[PDB]
Amino acid sequence: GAQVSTQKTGAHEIHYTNINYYKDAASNSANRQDFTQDPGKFTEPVKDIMVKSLPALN
């Protein structure tokens, strides 16, 4: 019941071990490898989206 994933190392210069022990999900370790983002609902909160080339509400 092992899980192997890459460590966090820098660019231009691994495969650790994770075994889930306790019988719950509140004992699972902190998911500190979620790098996902989408600034589409804090920027561009709009209908009729801009083009950046048109004069943008001319």
């Binding site: 589409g40 804090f42 909160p45 709009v46 209908k47 009729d48 509400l57 001319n58």
Partner: protein, 252 residues
């Protein structure tokens, strides 16, 4: 071009010729409660014609020295038609909104407003350990008003334009759905705000969902011959409304 915008909701239509855009909340359009999030079990009433329509609130004036306004918005529509009745007779209510704020001025006028729709705007009191009365956080469609100085009244909301009531930095208050009514280009401002809450269906009297704040940054400066009285008119309309738990009237 896209300056002419029309909105039809039921039997009330707003046509503006110098709009800016429509800010759709945090991207999410209003929707009825899908049954993956269903909590209560009895059938709700969705009127959809006598409720999803534009209701006009009171109009306030903007002189050279006015400081701000705030409206609580599940409460300012307490007594506006069948939205008010179906607020009263039920127990749980879920609805989106659609804010529209009319304010017009000529080309020889200048100034700029700021229309921010802050969720869960819990305000601090004027004194430190005093209980706020219900008739100072809201007054229905009667608008409250900020005071630019350090307000020190009894049983009163802490009125300060440089704190926005919550003690936040008022320049940083633009993370929410905001528009700028700069008077040189725009006639109005439109915010389509979906229903953000931690519970799926909530009551509409105990809870103040959000607060619409209009705070002037650029003051209404103009010549010595122009028209002084420049009003501000606000008209909103709920969306996707539904009501759960019909019971006897009143609230206590």
């Amino acid at each position: 071009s896209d300056r002419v915008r029309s909105i039809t909701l039921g039997n009330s239509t707003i046509t503006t010729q110098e709009s800016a855009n429509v800010v759709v909340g945090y991207g999410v359009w209003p929707d009825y409660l899908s049954d993956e999030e269903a909590t209560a079990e009895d059938q709700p009433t969705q009127p959809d014609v006598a409720t999803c329509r534009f209701y006009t609130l009171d109009s306030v004036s903007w002189m050279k020295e006015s400081q701000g306004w705030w409206w609580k918005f599940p409460d300012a529509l307490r007594d506006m038609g069948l939205f008010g009745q179906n607020m009263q007779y039920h127990y749980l209510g879920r609805s989106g909104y659609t804010i529209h704020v009319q304010c017009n001025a000529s080309k020889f006028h200048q100034g700029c407003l700021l229309v921010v729709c802050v969720p869960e705007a819990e305000m601090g009191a004027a004194n430190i350990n005093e209980k706020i009365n219900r008739e100072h956080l809201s007054n229905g469609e009667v608008a409250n008003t900020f005071s630019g100085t350090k307000s020190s009244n009894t049983n009163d909301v802490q009125q300060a334009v440089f704190n926005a009531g919550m003690g936040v930095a008022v320049g940083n208050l633009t993370i929410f759905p905001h528009q700028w009514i700069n008077l040189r280009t725009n006639n109005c401002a439109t915010i389509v705000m979906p229903y953000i809450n931690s519970v799926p269906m909530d009551n509409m009297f105990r809870h103040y969902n959000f607060t619409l704040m209009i705070i002037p940054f650029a003051k209404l400066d103009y010549a010595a011959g122009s028209s002084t009285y420049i009003p501000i008119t606000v008209t909103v309309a709920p969306m996707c409304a539904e009501y759960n738990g019909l019971r006897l009237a009143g609230h206590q």
